[PDB]
Design a protein around this nucleic acid. Structure first.
Ligand SMILES: Nc1nc2c(ncn2[C@H]2C[C@H](O)[C@@H](COP(=O)(O)OP(=O)(O)OP(=O)(O)O)O2)c(=O)[nH]1
Ligand SMILES: [Ca+2]
Ligand SMILES: [Ca+2]
Ligand SMILES: [Ca+2]
Ligand SMILES: [Ca+2]
Ligand SMILES: [Ca+2]
Length: 901
DNA sequence: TCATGTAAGCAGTCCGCG
DNA sequence: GCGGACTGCTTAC
């Protein structure tokens, strides 16, 4: 097999590399890598190295990496550019793996671990590590085993061995319900003392050294705790055995309002799953406890136990250990679904970076572009300092707040990457500038043509047309990858809808789910077999189709994120290729493209309708337009349609056969106007929206920019079994809105769009009457909590104290004296409830850690004093009033003359 | 919240507005 | 009471 790296590090003048050799074995080597850097050289002299602008360079070979680093410093002292890859390990990887890396995941040791630490005096701080580690569960992907290290004797209690037999049993048998599929994979090791446990753990670690190390909060908690606890008991040298090269560093992670410490383990790639989840999931959650995320992702119930976690080991060690094991498994289950580890490996090996660098689009693109240029013996420029400067972004149209009955939307494919490719925007393709007219002059096609030679953006920039820049070339590669996975995702989505339809008429039989590939549209034969299947088999197929869709989503959306990240990186001062001219060329071209096509669509539809100056485009944001289809429907007449699906088909055909060709003609003209390199402005129909045929539903509404709701029947070619609400920006979509309130507002919207005013009024009246019965957590607001200390003046709110911070200060007074009480953590999320006048907490609100029950000390008082009236007005009535006023609808029945009967 | 960008919405504080 | 200046937070893209 072809070799591939696992990890790479620079330690002084050595590269330390862990890798898989040609025989599939893991090896480690120390290489005295001699790096090269570059300086500009006279034009008259012969060389094969040129910078990105075609200026000749001489290569400088250094005796060692420290000499190279020192040379860069002296070049700064002199005032001359020191060119080349200054991150020598990237250069090492580029030299050692000068081909497209083919990796075998089965040879990569991925470790998932979690520790337990009993602490009687509050949260066990990793930097102090003053309490015994009393459990570690460490899953190894190569062995496919859960290694359980269990401390039986502690200063906080002596316990009996954990029983695998009890662990396996149902909760209803007094067991822990450790999933049957992992029972045979547990290797259980009890220990008489903590020193023995840790020494054995380190020996185990040496034998099975993680390449990828993951788990939940492992970077911020488990790793620093283990490192510091071992350091405290045995000394530094023993703790450094967590690094295969015996090198570690305390790394200070700084943010806007403070800093924290993590432990860098040289020769390991730490991908904390909480961080993978935050980057790759495209969710914003009210809580990031593993319980919460597991329930959200997997529909598993929270791990239930009596009493505080600080007493769980002594009261129920059996459950304590079982829950440690289950916690490790839940992360594996989330990854089986989301496939973020797979994604990280794909991206990392593609870029030729340390796998943990996938968190940085700047590092990722630096490596991709470096490798690409190196292939042509080209030399990358030195990174430079730049002041942070604001620059303009997208255009968003101000919508007229209203109901909108029939709507068809259209969207540009991968806009910013397409602009980069179309215009040929790259550091080395800048050709010059032209005299800019106001943007509206380009939009209306009255400005002078910018150039007859170069490819242009309306910010004034011109680009070469003779050859693609490295940015367009490399962005295209990832774009094409993204397109493939999006194809699989959408096929899985369409396949899911076939199954949903079939589930209306399930067969009374005993059968099995069909063995199919959900990434491809079901054949006619498969469709016929589906129509004969039982509900059990159909539901299993639906689950599998949906899992295939999620895998496709992960692969596609994050490749999209990577390419959009390149467009953003051009506007980040730390990017080697930072250039506000290029960053702004992209965004300004986007503004023109949207407004140009708004004009063209309005012109086209006014022609087919025989009107003048009518606005068909009701809204647009960045790359999408929303077109009122009322007049199109009315031209044939609603009574001509057999059912909802009939007019959806009609609009689908109208969009594809009439509007898209007109849109394409419009963009081809714009391409010619800007003299662009290649026409890549591809705007296709996105959504078809409207009320059910014959209903009193309003179809859709807008309240303002980035705030709307549509009842959608077809989305990018997926024809839904049941209409789907597309709601953007409204409170139903915000993590800050209480859970039960999101649900209620969504039903209000559903009724508005599908059923009408009377249905909405019926529901509102019921919710208002019953909502006080809702669980307090379900009606709590949510907020991130920053700068708690800043607004804390002697335990009370300082000037301009935010509402949620005031709530935290209230909580802090209520629990004062308790070392045991859950503390609110700076930067994390809290639940927030308003409090009635004259409550014993002495303020108008209270807040506590999100994803948790409020401590029993004050729970009863919170429940008694919760201000339901304020809660309802703020979270429910105010947003609903906004939706209904926009839609010209009443949520309460107005008096009429009939009331006199 | 260490980790690519800008546009723009709403909650809430402070306080003017005769 | 509501709107502007401002902070804080959160989405849409
Ligand atoms: N710099 C930067 N731009 C972004 C980011 N997210 C969205 N944008 C900009 C660039 C996108 O091309 C543009 C439109 O985004 P969309 O979500 O509508 O999707 P896009 O057209 O990129 O892809 P798609 O429609 O799914 O093919 O908005 C981002 O994270 N960074
Ligand atoms: Ca735990
Ligand atoms: Ca798009
Ligand atoms: Ca599309
Ligand atoms: Ca059937
Ligand atoms: Ca869009």
């Amino acid at each position: 097999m072809k070799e591939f790296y696992l990890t790479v590090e620079q330690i002084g003048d050595s590269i330390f590399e862990r890798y898989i050799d040609s025989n599939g074995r893991e090896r480690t080597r120390e290489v005295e890598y001699k790096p090269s850097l570059f300086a500009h050289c006279p034009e008259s002299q012969a060389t094969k190295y040129f910078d990105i602008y075609g200026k000749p360079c001489t290569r400088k070979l250094f005796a060692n990496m420290r000499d190279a680093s020192q040379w860069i410093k002296r070049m700064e002292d002199i005032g001359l550019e020191a060119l080349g890859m200054d991150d020598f390990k990237l250069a090492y990887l580029s030299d050692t793996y000068n081909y497209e890396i083919k990796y075998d995941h089965t040879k990569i040791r991925v470790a998932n671990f979690d520790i337990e630490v009993t602490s009687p005096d509050g949260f066990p701080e990793p930097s102090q590590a003053k309490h015994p580690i009393d459990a570690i569960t460490h899953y190894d992907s190569i062995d496919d085993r859960f290694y359980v290290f269990d401390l039986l004797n502690s200063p906080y209690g002596n316990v009996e061995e954990w029983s695998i037999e009890i662990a396996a049993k149902l909760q209803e048998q007094g067991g822990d319900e450790v999933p049957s599929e992992i029972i045979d994979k547990i290797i259980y090791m009890p220990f008489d003392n903590e020193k023995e446990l840790l020494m054995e753990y380190l020996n185990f670690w040496q034998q099975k050294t993680p390449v990828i190390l993951t788990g939940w909060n492992v970077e911020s908690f488990a790793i620093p705790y283990v490192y510091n606890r071992i350091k405290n008991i045995f000394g530094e040298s023993t703790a450094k055995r967590l690094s295969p090269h015996r090198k570690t560093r305390v790394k200070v992670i700084e943010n806007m309002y403070g800093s924290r410490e993590i432990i860098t383990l040289f020769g390991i790639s730490v991908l904390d799953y909480i961080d993978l989840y935050k980057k790759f999931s495209f969710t914003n959650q009210p809580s990031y406890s593993l319980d919460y995320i597991s329930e959200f992702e997997l529909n598993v119930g929270k791990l239930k136990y009596d009493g505080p976690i600080s007493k769980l080991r002594e009261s129920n060690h059996q459950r304590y250990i079982s829950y440690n094991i289950i916690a490790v498994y839940r992360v594996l289950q989330i990854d089986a679904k989301r496939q973020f580890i797979n994604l990280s490996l794909d991206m990392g090996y593609y870029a030729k970076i340390q796998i943990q660098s996938v968190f940085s689009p700047i590092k990722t693109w630096d490596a991709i572009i470096f490798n690409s240029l190196k292939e042509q013996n080209k030399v990358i420029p030195q990174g430079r300092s730049h002041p942070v400067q604001p620059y303009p972004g997208a255009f968003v149209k101000e919508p007229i707040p209203n109901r909108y009955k029939y709507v068809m939307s259209f969207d540009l494919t991968s806009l910013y990457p397409s602009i980069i490719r179309q215009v040929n925007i790259s550091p080395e393709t800048i050709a010059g500038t032209f005299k800019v007219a106001p943007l509206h002059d380009y939009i209306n096609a009255v400005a002078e043509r910018p150039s007859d030679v170069y490819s242009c953006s309306p910010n004034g920039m011109m680009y070469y047309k003779d050859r693609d820049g490295v940015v367009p070339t490399e962005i295209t590669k990832v774009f094409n990858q993204r397109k493939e996975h999006k194809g699989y995702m959408l096929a899985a989505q369409r396949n899911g809808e076939i199954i949903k339809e079939a589930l209306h008429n399930p067969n009374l039989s005993v059968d099995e789910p069909l063995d199919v590939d959900y990434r491809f549209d079901f054949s006619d034969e498969i469709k016929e077999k589906i129509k004969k299947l039982s509900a059990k088999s159909l539901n299993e197929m639906l689950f599998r189709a949906q899992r295939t869709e999620v895998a496709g989503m992960t692969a596609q959306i994050n490749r999209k994120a990577l390419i959009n990240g390149l467009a953003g990186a051009l506007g980040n001062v730390w990017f080697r290729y930072y250039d506000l001219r290029n960053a702004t060329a992209i965004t300004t071209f986007g503004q023109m493209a949207l407004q140009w096509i708004e004009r063209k669509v309005n012109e086209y539809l006014n022609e087919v309708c025989g009107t003048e100056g009518e606005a068909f485009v009701l809204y647009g944001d960045t790359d999408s337009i929303y077109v009122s289809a009322d007049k199109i429907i009315d031209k044939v007449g609603e009574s001509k349609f057999r059912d909802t699906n009939h007019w959806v088909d009609f609009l689908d055909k109208f969009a594809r056969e009439r509007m898209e060709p007109a849109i394409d003609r419009g963009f081809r003209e714009m391409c010619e106007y800007m003299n662009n390199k290649q026409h890549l402005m591809f705007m296709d129909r996105e959504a078809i929206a409207g009320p059910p045929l014959g209903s009193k539903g309003i179809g859709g509404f807008w309240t303002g920019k980035k705030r709307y709701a549509l009842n959608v029947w077809d989305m990018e070619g997926t024809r839904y079994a049941e209409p789907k609400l597309k709601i953007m920006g409204l409170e139903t979509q915000k993590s800050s809105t209480p859970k039960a309130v999101q649900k209620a507002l969504k039903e209000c919207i559903r009724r508005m769009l599908q059923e009408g005013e009377e249905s909405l009024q019926e529901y509102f009246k019921e919710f208002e009457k019953e909502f006080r019965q809702l669980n307090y957590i379900s009606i709590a607001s949510v907020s991130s909590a920053n700068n708690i200390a800043k607004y804390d003046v002697g335990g009370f709110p300082g000037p301009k104290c935010p509402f949620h911070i005031r709530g935290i200060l209230t909580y802090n007074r209520a629990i004062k004296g308790n070392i045991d009480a859950p503390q609110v953590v700076e930067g994390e999320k809290v639940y927030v409830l308003p409090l009635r006048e004259g409550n014993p907490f002495g303020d108008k609100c209270i807040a506590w850690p999100s994803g948790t029950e409020i401590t029993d000390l004050i729970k009863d008082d919170v429940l008694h004093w919760m201000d339901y009236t304020v809660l309802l007005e703020k979270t429910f009535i105010k947003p609903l009033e906004g939706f209904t006023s926009a839609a010209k609808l009443d949520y309460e029945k107005k008096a009429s003359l009939f009331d006199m009967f």
